[PDB]
């Protein structure tokens, strides 16, 4: 997406579903014997998501207005928005 | 005429109340069940950490 | 000096170096590992013996070839501070990342510093008012104080803080620091832009603001020492320039969170939930370096991204310890649609008192709290059996409380963009009068909807005319 | 306090916040690598607290009759009293 | 002394590891003594770890210890002193006095570990202890040789209940009693010491019909664990060796649970549910089985239990709940109503309650009492909202009787001549059956509810009816 973004050209990216990434990172982490975070989801899950999400941007005029809209699709646990992920 | 209506209303209100209370019972019960699971999990994590160390 | 080491391990950004030379950098020293992509500044945190330290790496580790030469740059990282840091947005290192070019550094100061002593304290009590009614009535601030905000961040949480910047910092003459840990880049760009626009930062000429921005993209370790970096800049103003300062921190949950991650990696067995064992000490040290001392009393605004609104998670709990006022903001009250979304039974200041802010203010607030507490108490009872089927005396109270809740709804100036409603800042003296009247039901002859999202009592009246149309 | 108590002088000791003492001992214990008791407060936190509290007393008249009075102050987090401390 | 010399290696709290020499062989459950300026520190050997390096638990405190310190071995489980000279003497965990009447011991000492008597040894009994406390007697019949259990929440006058029991039952009783305190507070201790000097059960001159074992929570968890074991053996010595029946009393066994939980964790045996040791059940079993009616004697334990936050669904009270013969639950509400004792009688169940066992009349009366009180409780909601008077006349009479009965449970206590000022009442079992029967028949429904309140038997009830009338 960033190749398009870094052409200045406008793009969009939909990440469906990061909730399944959380379970994946959980599996990987647990199998790496990294201590369980809250809801058994690792402590660097915040870091993972934040690094992923913040690479989507509307760049500056210099960078050609590089759009890359981000729409991450979260599958809410029982529809309860209070929940760590 | 009034007294019959009065008692009829008392019955009606008290019936609908039982229903409303029931709905709220169900809502807090589901929350209770989830909360129960969370306590188990939080305790479980403590044990896991302990075993790990 | 050239004191070599090799990178034995790179377990995350918690690199372990083996200083081949037995001359071993001390704890809290800073090291430069040279890389093709800049350099990495690492900070010694453990000595693990056999001249193998374990070092926090304040930059995002990648590319590292196992066994990489090190050079010791010594001591705590010394940031660059100045009047030429005003205007600047500075990296953790201190590098001006807004590219207003290099800081002409007068003093470069160590990141680590010690909080002033008990005897050095100068304990203030000077009222700071915002013009936000709910704040004024329930938890009035004090200039130089420690202010606190809790709940979900950027749920308009960021906006709330922005409103505070708009109000309080456009009424503060001294310096002001915005430090945003895990800041949302777009919001930051907007803020920087707004600051430049409102002259608060003016590219030419002086800026009464300085900026530190830490993005949540930046690795946890960098985020950990964003706080300390900002805190040093604050000390330069507090001490060296002497002047009273504002300070904003957004969010310090990110500081705690980062710490818990690194602690595990460090090898520290993780304390409850997962938090760092040193959570209390670090938070304590940091929040006492924002303290009210004979040299300056620094007004702080602390923003906690309470995770899932678990205040019982120890880090928000321990934040309350280091605060004199709190304004816990409730998601529920947000759902009730109230902006400000402040929990009204979970705001406090020690400034609220019957002589500190006078008996009349205190009585009015007392009555508001009691009335609302009753209304909340009867919420079950009301629902199962209507308020009609509850006591008449109470029914007046309930109707009144519904009005009071709505009265507390007040539009805000930079909320005006989002809400679309022109803001209101109402004088504190006016607020006491207004709420007093409502409690005496003087204006409880007009719709509940009238009180919603409006400022002063006069505005309610005018809006009654509007509703009537 | 015991010096006052010993003199036969009566006194009163407020231990605020004893809850924060527990956090401190938690930090120590886990970095002395001691096994964690429930809630990560070591399983001998009770021993520390019990010995402390029992040192407030009303002495006999042969022991003067001095008396230290104690008021410990425990924070309840969420009003939770089922909590170990 | 003994070649068995170990040098301390690690003081890691109460856990103290010792390095006995290769020739020498220690054994699990032994007692090590280390001469110290703080008496002799006793370490109980609990593991062997290899090359004669043991992991032992301290009883006394571990301050000032120097790793490398020569360690003598007693050679087996801690040895207390036993005798009939133990009577009216406070015996600390290692056996040393606190009553300060010099050398406690007759000519014997015994180890504090002993085995629970086998199935063959067990001898069943249906004998009925009498408390002399009318409500307790009727609605929770107690048994001689039993394992009575004073389950309750926070400090429900736990000591007070025990004091009343000692005041009535002990003086009446001809055997011995043993008062064992596990981590009990020294204020309570001083009161008990004084109180039993006053009641003369600690007979300053002459033999005392009680013995004392006072444990303080100040003493490390290890000492808290084996104060229980110490007391248990004293009762066994009485039961067995002196042959006499006893009335054991232990206080508070949740403190025993807490202590055991702590040293489990310290032993590295990862604490099980709600932080309670995985060995809780078996440890309870050893204590409980040890207390029984043998053919050598009969011992009636009354063991206090603290039920954390009145949650008996918690595994630790619940586990104890099974092992005890004759449960009682003390309830705050009833206490607040002013009734002494505070037991909620619909929350008290004693094993003896079988119809012919307690006698058909007693049983029938007790079924009726339970219903009468239960009727008042069930009807309480109706009386509360719908109103008192809307209920049936029959129901109202049952309520009136229940209110009279409720306050006929109120027996002012002798040991609450300091907690209420009003003297005790020692009411015979037969007298209680008769007086409660009468009330149910409605023969004294012409006597006010408050004329049953804080007075004894029927004679007293009438007297207070007259007194109020006057």
DSSP labels for A29-80? HHHTTPPP-GGG--TTHHHHHHHHHTT--B--GGGT--B-EEEEE---GGG-
Question: Ramachandran region of residue E53, left (φ > 0), alpha (ψ -120 to 50) or beta?
Answer: beta
> For residues C320 and C284, is the Cβ–Cβ distance under 8 A?
no
E307 touches chain D (CB under 8 A): no
Rounded to 5 degrees, φ, ψ at C276 are: -60, 145
Q: How many CA atoms lie within 13 A of E200 on its CB side?
A: 4
Q: Is CATH 2.40.10.170 the right assignment for the domain spanning E2-77?
A: yes
Tokens representing E310 are 């009145």
> For residues E97 and E89, is the Cβ–Cβ distance under 8 A?
yes
Rounded to 5 degrees, φ, ψ at C413 are: -65, -45
Residue E303: name the closest of E216, E178, E208, E460 by CA: E178
Q: Is CATH 1.10.10.10 the right assignment for the domain spanning C1-76?
A: no
C51 touches chain A (CB under 8 A): no
CATH topology (fold) of E353-470: 1.10.1140
Rounded to 5 degrees, φ, ψ at E305 are: -140, 145
Active-site residue flag, C157? yes
Sequence-ordered alpha helix ranges (H) in C90-224: 133-138, 157-168, 185-197, 220-224
Sequence-ordered alpha helix ranges (H) in E220-340: 221-239, 253-267, 280-290, 315-323, 332-336
Chains meeting B at 3+ CB pairs closer than 8 A?
A, C, D, E
> For residues C153 and C251, is the Cβ–Cβ distance under 8 A?
yes
Return the exposure string of C147-160: e unless at least 16 CB atoms fall within 10 Å of the residue's CB, then b: bbbbbbbbebbbbb
Q: Distance (Å) from the C-alpha of residue B42 to the closest C-alpha of chain D?
A: 10
Residues of D in contact with E270 (CB under 8 A): 35
> For residues E149 and E327, is the Cβ–Cβ distance under 8 A?
yes
Q: Which residues contact E458 (CB under 8 A, 6 or more apart)?
A: E431, E434, E435, E438, E444
Task: State the CB neighbour count (10 A cutoff) for residue B49.
Answer: 19
C-alpha–C-alpha distance, residues E74 and C367, integer Å = 71
C-alpha–C-alpha distance, residues C301 and C317, integer Å = 16
- How many helices (H) and strands (E) would you count in chain C? 16, 18
Strand order in the sheet with C325-329: C89-90, C209-215, C175-183, C245-250, C299-303, C146-150, C325-329, C342-349
Q: Is C103 exposed, middle or buried (0-12, 13-18, 19+ CB in 10 A)?
A: buried
How large is the angle between the packed helices C226-235 and C279-287, nearest 10 degrees?
Answer: 30
Q: Which residues of E74-191 form beta strands (DSSP E)?
A: 79-82, 108-111, 147-152, 178-181
Chains C and B touch (3+ CB pairs under 8 A): yes
> For residues E371 and E348, is the Cβ–Cβ distance under 8 A?
no
Binding site feature residues of E for ATP: 152-159
Residues of chain C with CATH 3.40.50.300: 77-351
Residues of A in contact with B49 (CB under 8 A): 35-36
C-alpha–C-alpha distance, residues C253 and C152, integer Å = 10
Active-site residue flag, E351? no
How big is chain A by its Cα radius of gyration, in Å? 16
C-alpha–C-alpha distance, residues C311 and C233, integer Å = 30
Q: Which residues contact C340 (CB under 8 A, 6 or more apart)?
A: C132, C134, C135, C160, C329, C408, C409, C410, C412
Taking CA–CA distances from B49, the nearest residue in chain E reads E270
Q: Which residues of E134-223 form beta strands (DSSP E)?
A: 147-152, 178-181, 211-214
C-alpha–C-alpha distance, residues C325 and C299, integer Å = 11
- Please give the DSSP secondary-structure letter assigned to residue C428: H
Residues of B in contact with D40 (CB under 8 A): 46, 49
Terminal-to-terminal C-alpha distance of chain B: 78
Strand order in the sheet with E178-181: E211-214, E178-181, E248-250, E301-306, E147-152, E326-330, E343-350
C145 is annotated as contributing to ligand binding: no
Token pair 């004199």 is at which residue? C324
C-alpha–C-alpha distance, residues E46 and E26, integer Å = 10
> For residues D4 and D61, is the Cβ–Cβ distance under 8 A?
no
Q: Distance (Å) from the C-alpha of residue E16 to the closest C-alpha of chain B?
A: 20
C-alpha–C-alpha distance, residues E146 and C264, integer Å = 53
How big is chain B by its Cα radius of gyration, in Å? 23
Largest CA distance in chain E: 87
C158 is annotated as contributing to ligand binding: yes
Question: Ramachandran region of residue E144, left (φ > 0), alpha (ψ -120 to 50) or beta?
Answer: beta
The CATH number of C352-469 is 1.10.1140.10
Question: How many residues comprise chain B?
Answer: 53
From B34, B41, B49, residue closest to A35, measured CB to CB: B49
C-alpha–C-alpha distance, residues C88 and C101, integer Å = 9
Distance of CA C232 to the CA centre of its chain: 16
C-alpha–C-alpha distance, residues E236 and E292, integer Å = 9
Taking CB atoms and an 8 Å limit, are D27 and C272 in contact across chains?
A: no
User: Which H or E run contains E11?
Assistant: strand E6-12
C-alpha–C-alpha distance, residues C28 and C23, integer Å = 15
Rounded to 5 degrees, φ, ψ at E133 are: -115, 115
Strand E326-330, strand E301-306: pairing: unpaired
Taking CB atoms and an 8 Å limit, are C385 and B53 in contact across chains?
A: no
Taking CB atoms and an 8 Å limit, are D38 and B46 in contact across chains?
A: yes
> For residues E412 and E390, is the Cβ–Cβ distance under 8 A?
no
Q: How distant, in Å, are the alpha carbons of A68, C66, E402 from that of E54? A: 66, 43, 63
Sequence-ordered alpha helix ranges (H) in E100-252: 134-139, 158-165, 171-172, 186-198, 221-239
Taking CA–CA distances from C220, the nearest residue in chain A reads A47
C-alpha–C-alpha distance, residues C85 and C208, integer Å = 10
C-alpha–C-alpha distance, residues C7 and C69, integer Å = 7
From E187, E262, E309, residue closest to D43, measured CB to CB: E262
Residues of chain E with CATH 2.40.10.170: 2-77
Give residues preceding each break in chain A, C–N over 2.5 A. Answer: none
C-alpha–C-alpha distance, residues E214 and E218, integer Å = 12
Residues of chain E with CATH 3.40.50.300: 78-352
User: Which H or E run contains C41?
Assistant: strand C39-47
Q: Which residues contact C193 (CB under 8 A, 6 or more apart)?
A: none
CATH for the B14-53 domain, from 1.10.1740.10, 3.40.50.300, 1.10.287.80, 1.20.1250.20: 1.10.287.80
Tokens representing C301 are 């605004």
Active-site residue flag, C184? yes
Binding site feature residues of E: 152-159
> For residues C347 and C327, is the Cβ–Cβ distance under 8 A?
yes
Return the exposure string of C366-383: e unless at least 16 CB atoms fall within 10 Å of the residue's CB, then b: eebeebbeebeebeeebe
E7, E105, E171, E185: the active-site residue: E185
Sequence-ordered alpha helix ranges (H) in chain D: 2-6, 18-30, 45-53
SS3 category, C73: coil
Q: How many CA atoms lie within 13 A of C87 on its CB side?
A: 16
User: Which H or E run contains E347?
Assistant: strand E343-350
Residues of E in contact with D81 (CB under 8 A): 309
C-alpha–C-alpha distance, residues C457 and E241, integer Å = 89
- Please give the DSSP secondary-structure letter assigned to residue E308: G
Residues of C in contact with D80 (CB under 8 A): 312
Tokens representing C280 are 């209390």
Strand partners of residue E148: E302, E326
C183, C218, C235, C261: the active-site residue: C183
Sign of CA pseudo-dihedral E194, E197, E201, E203: positive
C-alpha–C-alpha distance, residues C95 and C80, integer Å = 8
Domain C77-351: CATH architecture, name and number where available: 3-Layer(aba) Sandwich (3.40)
> For residues E408 and E436, is the Cβ–Cβ distance under 8 A?
yes
- How many helices (H) and strands (E) would you count in chain B? 1, 0
Residues of chain E with CATH 1.10.1140.10: 353-470
Q: Which residues contact E352 (CB under 8 A, 6 or more apart)?
A: E126, E128, E141, E142, E143, E326, E358
User: Which H or E run contains E371?
Assistant: helix E360-385
Distance of CA E83 to the CA centre of its chain: 22
Residue of D5, D45, D46 best to disrupt the E interface, most CBs of E under 10 A: D46
C-alpha–C-alpha distance, residues D71 and D17, integer Å = 11
From B13, B24, B49, residue closest to C383, measured CB to CB: B24
Taking CA–CA distances from C381, the nearest residue in chain B reads B21
Q: Which residues contact C10 (CB under 8 A, 6 or more apart)?
A: C16, C61, C64, C66
Taking CA–CA distances from D49, the nearest residue in chain E reads E218
Question: How many residues comprise chain E?
Answer: 470
Strand E301-306, strand E248-250: pairing: parallel
How large is the angle between the packed helices E360-385 and E393-406, nearest 10 degrees?
Answer: 110
- Please give the DSSP secondary-structure letter assigned to residue E166: I
User: Which H or E run contains C403?
Assistant: helix C392-408
Tokens representing C329 are 């903001």
> For residues C227 and C179, is the Cβ–Cβ distance under 8 A?
yes
SS3 category, C121: strand
Q: Which residues contact E355 (CB under 8 A, 6 or more apart)?
A: E363, E364
Q: Which residues numbered 15-54 in A keep a CB inside 8 Å of some CB on B?
A: 33, 35-36, 39-40
Residue B42: name the closest of D60, E77, C310, E87 by CA: C310
Task: State the CB neighbour count (10 A cutoff) for residue C141.
Answer: 25
Distance of CA D49 to the CA centre of its chain: 4
Q: How distant, in Å, are the alpha carbons of C354, C360, E450 from that of C364? A: 10, 6, 47
Chains meeting C at 3+ CB pairs closer than 8 A?
A, B, D
Q: Which residues contact E180 (CB under 8 A, 6 or more apart)?
A: E213, E215, E227, E228, E230, E231, E232, E234, E248, E249, E250, E251
> For residues E242 and E235, is the Cβ–Cβ distance under 8 A?
no
Contacts 24+ apart (CB under 8 A), C359-365: C360/C432, C360/C436, C361/C137, C361/C432, C364/C137, C364/C432, C364/C435, C364/C436, C364/C439, C365/C137, C365/C138
Q: Distance (Å) from the C-alpha of residue C270 to the closest C-alpha of chain A?
A: 8
Q: How many CA atoms lie within 13 A of C453 on its CB side?
A: 14
SS3 category, A18: helix
Peptide bond into C462 cis (omega under 30): no
Q: Which residues contact C253 (CB under 8 A, 6 or more apart)?
A: C153, C304, C305, C306, C307, C315, C316
The CATH number of E78-352 is 3.40.50.300
How big is chain C by its Cα radius of gyration, in Å? 25
Q: How distant, in Å, are the alpha carbons of E139, E308, E410, E425 from that of E341? A: 13, 20, 7, 12
> For residues C327 and C149, is the Cβ–Cβ distance under 8 A?
yes
């Amino acid at each position: 997406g960033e190749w398009f973004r870094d052409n200045g050209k406008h793009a969009l990216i939909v990440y469906d579903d990061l909730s399944k990434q959380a379970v994946a990172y959980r599996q990987l982490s647990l199998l790496l014997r990294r201590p369980p975070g809250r809801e058994a989801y690792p402590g660097d899950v915040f870091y993972l998501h934040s690094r992923l999400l913040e690479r989507a941007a509307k760049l500056s005029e210099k960078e050609g207005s590089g759009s890359l809209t981000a729409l991450p699709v979260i599958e809410t646990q029982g529809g309860d928005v209070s929940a760590y992920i | 005429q009034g007294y019959a209506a009065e008692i009829s209303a008392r019955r009606n209100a008290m019936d609908n109340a039982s229903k409303n209370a029931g709905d709220m019972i169900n809502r807090y019960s589901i929350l209770y069940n989830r909360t129960r699971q969370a306590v188990i999990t939080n305790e479980l994590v403590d044990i896991i950490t302990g075993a790990s160390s | 000096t050239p004191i070599t080491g090799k990178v034995t391990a790179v377990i995350g950004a918690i690199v372990d170096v083996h200083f081949e030379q037995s001359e071993l950098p001390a704890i809290l020293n800073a090291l430069e590992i040279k890389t093709p992509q800049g350099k990495l500044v690492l900070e010694v945190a453990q000595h693990l013996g056999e001249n193998t330290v374990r070092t926090i790496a304040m930059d995002g580790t990648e590319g590292l070839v196992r066994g990489e030469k090190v050079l010791d740059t010594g001591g705590p990282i010394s940031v660059p501070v100045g009047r030429e840091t005003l205007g600047r947005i500075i990296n953790v290192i201190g590098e001006p990342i807004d590219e207003r070019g290099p800081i002409k550094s007068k003093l470069r100061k160590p990141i680590h510093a010690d909080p002033p002593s008990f005897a050095e304290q100068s304990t203030s009590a000077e009222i700071l008012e915002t013009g936000i009614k709910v704040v004024d009535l329930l938890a009035p601030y004090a200039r130089g104080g420690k202010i606190g905000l809790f709940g979900g961040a950027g749920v308009g949480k960021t906006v709330f803080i922005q409103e505070l910047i708009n109000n309080i910092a456009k009424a503060h003459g001294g310096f002001s620091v915005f430090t945003g840990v895990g800041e949302r880049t777009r919001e930051g760009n907007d803020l920087y832009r707004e600051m430049k626009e409102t002259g608060v930062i003016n590219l030419e000429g002086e800026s009464k603001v300085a900026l530190v921005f830490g993005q949540m993209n930046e690795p946890p370790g960098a985020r950990a020492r964003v706080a300390l970096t900002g805190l040093t800049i604050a000390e330069y103003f507090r001490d060296e320039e002497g002047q009273d300062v504002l300070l904003f921190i957004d969010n310090i949950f990110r500081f705690t969170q980062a710490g818990s991650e690194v602690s595990a990696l460090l090898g520290r067995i993780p304390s409850a939930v997962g938090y760092q064992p040193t959570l209390a000490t670090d938070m304590g040290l940091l929040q006492e370096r924002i303290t009210t001392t004979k040299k300056g009393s620094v007004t702080s605004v602390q923003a906690v991204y309470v995770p899932a609104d678990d205040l019982t998670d120890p880090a928000p709990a321990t934040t309350f310890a280091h605060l004199d006022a709190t304004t816990v903001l409730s998601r529920g009250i947000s759902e009730l649609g109230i902006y400000p979304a402040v929990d009204p039974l979970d705001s406090k200041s020690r400034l609220l008192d019957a002589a500190v802010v006078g008996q009349e203010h205190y009585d009015v607030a007392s009555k508001v709290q009691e009335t609302l507490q009753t209304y909340k108490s009867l919420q079950d009872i009301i629902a199962i059996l209507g308020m009609d089927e509850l006591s008449e005396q109470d029914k007046l109270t309930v109707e009144r409380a519904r009005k009071i809740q709505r009265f507390l709804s007040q539009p805000f100036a930079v909320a005006e963009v989002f809400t679309g409603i022109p803001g209101k800042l109402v004088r504190l003296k006016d607020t006491v009068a207004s709420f007093k009247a409502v409690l005496e039901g003087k204006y409880d002859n007009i719709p509940e909807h009238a009180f919603y999202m409006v400022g002063g009592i006069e505005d309610v009246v005018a809006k009654a005319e509007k509703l009537a149309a």
